[PDB]
Amino acid sequence: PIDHTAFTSPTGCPVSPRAAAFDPFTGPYQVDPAASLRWSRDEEPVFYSPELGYWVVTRYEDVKAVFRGNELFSPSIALEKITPTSDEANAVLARYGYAMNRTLVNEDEPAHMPRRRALMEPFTPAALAHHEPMVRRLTREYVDRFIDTGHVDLVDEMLWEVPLTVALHFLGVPEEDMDTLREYSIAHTVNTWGRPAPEQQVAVADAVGKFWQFAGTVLDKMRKDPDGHGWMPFGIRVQQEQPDVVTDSYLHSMMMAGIVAAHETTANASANALRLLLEHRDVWEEICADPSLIPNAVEECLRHSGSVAAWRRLVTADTTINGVEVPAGAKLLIVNSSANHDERHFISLDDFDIRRDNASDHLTFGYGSHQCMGKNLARMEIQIFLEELTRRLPHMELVPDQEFTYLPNTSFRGPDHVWVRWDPARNPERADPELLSRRQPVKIGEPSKNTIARTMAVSGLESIADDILLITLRDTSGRPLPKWSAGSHIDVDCGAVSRQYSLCGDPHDRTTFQVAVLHDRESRGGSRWIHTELAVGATLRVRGPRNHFKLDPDAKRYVFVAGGIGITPVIAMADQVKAAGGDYEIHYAGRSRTSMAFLDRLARDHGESVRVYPGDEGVRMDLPSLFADPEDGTQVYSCGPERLLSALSEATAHWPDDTLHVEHFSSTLEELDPSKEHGFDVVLKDSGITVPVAADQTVLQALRAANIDAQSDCEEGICGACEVPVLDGEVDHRDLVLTKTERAAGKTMMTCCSRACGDKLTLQL
Ligand code: HEM
Ligand SMILES: Cc1cc2nc3c(=O)[nH]c(=O)nc-3n(C[C@H](O)[C@H](O)[C@H](O)COP(=O)(O)O)c2cc1C
């Protein structure tokens, strides 16, 4: 028989050599788990492992599919200890009378979701903004102790400690009470996910029992100051609001559950990223140049080298997973580390590419119902760790010929030590001391696609009209800029905000972009900043050309009407048409000829074809005359203040439907007024959850309330950064970016202002 020849799975099927040689505790999976299962991604995506007791799942679609089906794959076993707790160690636990409830990571439905939704808000990026000064304080309090040595183990002296303290601060525990809770804070990787000796088991049960009853007093102490900062005081108020949802046992569990979910995973992530970066030192020095790429950098590290090598689910019914039959009761080892390295979803994957537009898809934080709530707390934490160490010690390198040891376990991965040298005298810090007052705002919660950007340099500022600059933006990389058609714009960070400005430069010049910003007399801050505090030699983050003002090139004729600074996109459209060799007519109005940019440019070219109508002299553009009656072929693109765009739309109402195209520089909306608006449900098919949107609530607000990744720049319906695909349902379109045909197809929606017409929509999210 075959049982005389090879091992057999619990389903009676034979087991492969490579599958039976799988060991998560030693050898190839401890050195590099992702590479150690390359053979499984290629030829056997799902197998039974004899060494450990689980079925192993290796490819990214599959382990994402396990995360979403939370009815079929239960997190019951999420922190089940690999080897069982001995009678001795249970007796030690019982002596402190410790009884922890399953707290969000183990909880099945229907208990898990109400507790997650109730306890979610402090984890959102908006709520985390309060804690950003605290982590910057703690990150530096540590680094300046070893700053002058030129030699440190980052792990023990910096990265093992800091995530523990901020977790205590995130939880809301008094600083008086913190130093002991840390004394009782220990590593759990080998005791939960490894093969510990009986002595190890008890030493954990002793430290965990000590911590359980001390945290019991701490909860009683803060029990009567509920209205203060922290997750636990936030938890107390929901108890009075929902006494059955949130129980005295639960927040006592929430005390330990909180900082064991937060300490080692973040420390290991920090250590991995620093080891991973100091291995490719060119990309290290890139981060040292500008810290603008830190946010996506830490995302590529989390994909490439996460703190979670694998995770676990309990199969609840007989299923098949990618052709392999899996029985009810089977335990799954879903290798997040292999998933992050699956060629079917990422491309050139074992490459460490921090500008990767794909990093955000890694499963290091999990996926779906139980996705890590503190992911943005950890994202912020890593980002600041990695800005201070790139700011102060860019001349830091790894001690060569260094061997990195990682504790034998199935799920957690982080070096025992990372040893780094640097030249102490050479710190940029001691000659500055200006770099420290520099603080870069955290950017968390946004997908990697929406945060990729080129940091260009300003090579020249030219005044071409009153209150109008012409900015010349140079790419410092040296590598050529994208091709862009007329009407295209860019999103440039004007200080703490981003604005978009059309491109009026030369397209055939592909070492530069040119924009002509106007000083808005009533300026919410973006236009002022450019005029008031930008000089030559600065560098601005600028996110590649998009275009909502594209021209159909097969039209008979183009007549362009332009008001004020609306001259910028049209003049590039005028240039395309002169190149084509096509009839066009351009009409340019403005308050004053002195304040009308590009008349010089408009005189040297298109001068035979331009007519000017400056207001100050008194010659005005009367659209009624111009568009008195149409012609079949003529199209009209136009851009300027809303008053002329509106009035023009009136004058061109006589014409065929697709005749007029406009680009708005301002937004109309809005008034929310739920009274006129109805709530609905939005379900996220990829994630496998339904988020409710209230009448007073935008779709965008509900997504960030579930801490789903989203980027929003304008939220006035004008910029386009919040677009997301619609699989089902018809949408109440309220943006100004999508063409009336794009709104018809219903394939897409703007997260911040558009809604449902109706009861539900399905989004690819
Ligand atoms: C980079 C460091 C971190 C990694 C790699 C990580 C990974 C995870 C993973 C894989 C899960 C389970 C996912 C699932 O079963 O869908 C998880 C659940 C969780 N994480 Fe983390 N996490 C980190 C930092 C944190 C921090 C700092 C907190 C804040 C205290 C945190 C709070 C949680 C909570 C509360 C859950 C359970 C939520 C639920 O099951 O609804 N995590 N985390
Ligand atoms: C030359 C120029 C081009 C602009 N192009 C666009 C654009 O293509 N899309 C857009 O939404 N806004 C555009 N704007 C408007 C700006 O984004 C912004 O609202 C304006 O300059 C004022 O910023 P502030 O009110 O924050 O000071 C443009 C403004 C200027 C001066």
Ligand code: FES
């Ligand atoms: S955020 Fe710019 S359109 Fe929604």
